[PDB]
Amino acid sequence: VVDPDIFNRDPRDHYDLLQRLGGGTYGEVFKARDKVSGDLVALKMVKMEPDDDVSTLQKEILILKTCRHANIVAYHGSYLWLQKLWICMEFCGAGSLQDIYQVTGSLSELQISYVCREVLQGLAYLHSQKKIHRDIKGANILINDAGEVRLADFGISAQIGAELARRLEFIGTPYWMAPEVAAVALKGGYNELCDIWSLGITAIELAELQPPLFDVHPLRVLFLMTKSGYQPPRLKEKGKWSAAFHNFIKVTLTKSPKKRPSATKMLSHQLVSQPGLNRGLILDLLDKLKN
Amino acid sequence: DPDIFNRDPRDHYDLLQRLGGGTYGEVFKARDKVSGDLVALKMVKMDDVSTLQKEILILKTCRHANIVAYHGSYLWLQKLWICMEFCGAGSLQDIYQVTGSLSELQISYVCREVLQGLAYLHSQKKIHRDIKGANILINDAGEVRLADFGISAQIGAELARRLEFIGTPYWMAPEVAAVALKGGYNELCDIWSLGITAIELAELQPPLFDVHPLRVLFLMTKSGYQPPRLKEKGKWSAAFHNFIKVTLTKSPKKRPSATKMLSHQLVSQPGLNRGLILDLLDKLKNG
Ligand SMILES: Cc1c(-c2ccc(N)c(C(=O)N(C)C)c2F)cnc2c1C1(C=N2)CC1
Numbered sequence: 183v184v185d186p187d188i189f190n191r192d193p194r195d196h197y198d199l200l201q202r203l204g205g206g207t208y209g210e211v212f213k214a215r216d217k218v219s220g221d222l223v224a225l226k227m228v229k230m231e232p233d234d235d236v237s238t239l240q241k242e243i244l245i246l247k248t249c250r251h252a253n254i255v256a257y258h259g260s261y262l263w264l265q266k267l268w269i270c271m272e273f274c275g276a277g278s279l280q281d282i283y284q285v286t287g288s289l290s291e292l293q294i295s296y297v298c299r300e301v302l303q304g305l306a307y308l309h310s311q312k313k314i315h316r317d318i319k320g321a322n323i324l325i326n327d328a329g330e331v332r333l334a335d336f337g338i339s340a341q342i343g344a345e346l347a348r349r350l351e352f353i354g355t356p357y358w359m360a361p362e363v364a365a366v367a368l369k370g371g372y373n374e375l376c377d378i379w380s381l382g383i384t385a386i387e388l389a390e391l392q393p394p395l396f397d398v399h400p401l402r403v404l405f406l407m408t409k410s411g412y413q414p415p416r417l418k419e420k421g422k423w424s425a426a427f428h429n430f431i432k433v434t435l436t437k438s439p440k441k442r443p444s445a446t447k448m449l450s451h452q453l454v455s456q457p458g459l460n461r462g463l464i465l466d467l468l469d470k471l472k473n
Numbered sequence: 474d475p476d477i478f479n480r481d482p483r484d485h486y487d488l489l490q491r492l493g494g495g496t497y498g499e500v501f502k503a504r505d506k507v508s509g510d511l512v513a514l515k516m517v518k519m520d521d522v523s524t525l526q527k528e529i530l531i532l533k534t535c536r537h538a539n540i541v542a543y544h545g546s547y548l549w550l551q552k553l554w555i556c557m558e559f560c561g562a563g564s565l566q567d568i569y570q571v572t573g574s575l576s577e578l579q580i581s582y583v584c585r586e587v588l589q590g591l592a593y594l595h596s597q598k599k600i601h602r603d604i605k606g607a608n609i610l611i612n613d614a615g616e617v618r619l620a621d622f623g624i625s626a627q628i629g630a631e632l633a634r635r636l637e638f639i640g641t642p643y644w645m646a647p648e649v650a651a652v653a654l655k656g657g658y659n660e661l662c663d664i665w666s667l668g669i670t671a672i673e674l675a676e677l678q679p680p681l682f683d684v685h686p687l688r689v690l691f692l693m694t695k696s697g698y699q700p701p702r703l704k705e706k707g708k709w710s711a712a713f714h715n716f717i718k719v720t721l722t723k724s725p726k727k728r729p730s731a732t733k734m735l736s737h738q739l740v741s742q743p744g745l746n747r748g749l750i751l752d753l754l755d756k757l758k759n760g
Pocket residue numbers: 202203204205208211224226255271272273274275276277278281324334335
């Protein structure tokens with residue numbers, strides 16, 4: 183079973199499919215309008231042939247289903263009919279932050295600070311449920327018309343969760359296994375603080391329209407990060423940003439995960455606990471986006 | 474593989490009987506039709522072939538007395554046949570399941586031979602990762618050979634294919650990248666596996682064998698896990714208890730290497746020769 187609450191009916195009987203969303207970057211996601219109501223929803227359709235493995239699909243749905251938080255994109259349910267699975271989610275009218283800043287340019291420090299607080303609130307909830315996003319970036323941070331910040335796309339989170347569960351289910355005999363090998367089999371070799379690092383990179387991305395080292399080959403970036411003298415990235419223009427923002431970058435981009443602060447600890451940081459942070463900052467950004 | 478034979482292995486070999494009950498796959502005892510020599514032929518039905526290619530590369534680049542020898546590979550009719558040295562007594566597990574527990578001297582000799590093989594493998598930057606009684610083979614001469622690099626090849630192939638499909642790492646944390654490049658552990662896991670194997674040969678099971686395998690994985694991570702010990706304390710000498718204690722060192726940063734372990738009192742003691750296992754095999758034949 184993909185889900186004990188699947189609607190075994192075609193969603194086109196309840197929804198008018200309006201247009202495609204995100205250019206396929208997030209999959210086959212459509213904007214859709216309810217028929218008896220005006221309510222708008224996002225519908226992501228996945229082909230479902232019988233001989234396909236649906237293990238990764240089932241985890242993603244369960245991750246989205248089990249989240250009830252104001253900074254995580256809302257889940258409505260799933261439709262299964264005629265070998266098509268439609269995942270029904272809240273429609274975030276402004277797209278991702280990457281779509282936004284490609285139009286408005288770099289965000290103000292206050293807008294970045296608001297985003298970082300809202301993502302940290304979502305990450306704190308996720309981590310408290312023993313979940314790891316593992317794909318925090320501008321493209322996976324959606325903004326709705328109400329100016330709210332919602333984390334989205336747990337696809338990578340599902341791939342990893344099903345991948346580790348696959349190897350565990352067919353683990354065979356671990357009775358001769360070494361404790362560190364068993365740890366990596368169960369826990370995967372890292373923890374939820376990888377999300378804190380990704381947020382730090384995302385804050386730079388919102389400041390500069392690019393993550394650091396974006397022109398470097400992917401395998402060369404992985405190669406540089408695994409050397410003893412690795413230097414965590416920094417903001418380009420020092421005089422453009424406050425010391426609080428610089429310190430926020432410095433602590434979120436701590437090399438050693440054993441010293442990187444948690445999502446909850448980071449919520450007490452000077453940058454994201456300042457009084458001038460409110461949704462008006464985002465609604466102001468959407469006004470600029472409307473031009 | 475450019476040295477691969479493009480023919481039916483039965484051109485050269487007479488297939489005599491299946492080996493190991495299928496635990497090791499489709500493995501055949503075979504006689505060389507001109508030499509008369511005996512070999513073991515593993516038949517693999519051939520999709521991805523990177524894991525199988527890696528397992529053979531690990532094997533053919535091994536030239537050491539304590540690693541089962543590699544003779545060649547036949548490719549014929551979607552079947553790959555890997556020709557290896559035949560160990561006529563099977564594995565230690567096959568043996569102690571009829572003879573009972575090994576003597577300490579026999580166990581000490583076994584451990585010395587495995588450490589020799591492990592030290593050679595690690596000097597090639599290879600990790601066995603599946604050391605246990607079933608993978609320690611014994612020939613009729615009482616000599617000891619490590620076998621079956623199936624797990625080893627899988628771990629190497631999975632780590633390479635994940636690097637091929639990693640995505641964009643610009644937002645990725647460095648400890649995530651280190652796992653993608655180095656896996657999370659090193660060759661010192663084999664030393665731990667040898668310690669458990671030593672207990673297996675002494676007590677006919679590894680520790681916690683009656684515990685559910687997933688719970689066993691869980692207990693090993695509880696952050697307070699304690700390394701196992703030998704059950705009958707007075708039955709074994711202090712060198713054996715200490716050998717188990719140092720091979721079963723929890724932290725990998727402090728676990729001794731194979732080469733270092735080779736200078737431990739238990740494996741450097743005199744009288745350790747294949748005659749100890751010739752006695753074991755004779756017990757298998759008579760008792
Ligand atoms: C993908 C997505 C988006 C989205 C993202 C970028 C976009 N550029 C657009 C777009 O095309 N717009 C005209 C706004 C978009 F709709 C908005 N909410 C969503 C989703 C999901 C669930 N809720 C993840 C599947």
